[PDB]
Amino acid sequence: RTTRDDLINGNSASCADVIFIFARGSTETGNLGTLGPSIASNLESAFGKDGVWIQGVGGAYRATLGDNALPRGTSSAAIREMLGLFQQANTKCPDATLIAGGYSQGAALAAASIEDLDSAIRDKIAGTVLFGYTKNLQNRGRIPNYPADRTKVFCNTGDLVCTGSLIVAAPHLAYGPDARGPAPEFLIEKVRAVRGS
């Protein structure tokens, strides 16, 4: 449900082919929040339960609302936590294709982590999805040091955080349909583009 630790719990001897690391929004529960479970269900349908590991960013990432105001849109401790997860994936399963995503503060977290990542690991992330991306305007719809063709941003009209503000309006809470369809569609397509099928 809202908590998935497939990478942490996973057996190195039987690595999944695909590893998905997702960061939840502010004040959300577990380590997947409101959108992560929907994406996970569809990924499992496409790759099979044993074909993909779903890993939420928990630990030091408290998803504290106030941290949206920090320089990178999240805390240093949260960035360290997500970086460590990408590092764990790379060490535990060097041949797995990675995919990532985040919502709201988690989208800023995903962008900051990917920017700081060792390039050899960053280059293994086949696709990244960002919902209600709080640094959308500041970063011009991109994740620094990461290609545009591997990035998909879902920013609703009227979602003020996509337009340089930190005000939470109704459109910021309307990403359900995207998480159920286009987001997993994009991730599956990007994985198949490099892995074949």
Give the integer Cα–Cα distance in Å for 114 and 50.
26
Which residues belong to the active site? 104, 159, 172
- The beta strands (E) that lie in the chain are given as 18-23, 52-56, 97-103, 125-131, 151-154
- Please tell me the class of the 1-197 domain: alpha beta
Residue for token digits 């992330």? 125
- Which residues are registered as beta bridge partners of 98? 19, 125
Q: Residue ranges of the domains in the chain?
A: 1-197
First vs last Cα of the chain: how many Å apart?
27
Q: What is the resolution of this structure in A?
A: 1.7
Q: How far is CA 36 from CA 144, 178, 197, in A?
A: 23, 11, 24
Experimental method, per PDB record: X-ray
Which residue in 145, 77, 71 sits closest to 108, CA to CA? 71
For residues 68-86, b (16+ Cβ closer than 10 Å) or e, as one string? beeebbbbeebbebbbebb
The values of phi and psi at residue 48, to 5°, are 85, 150
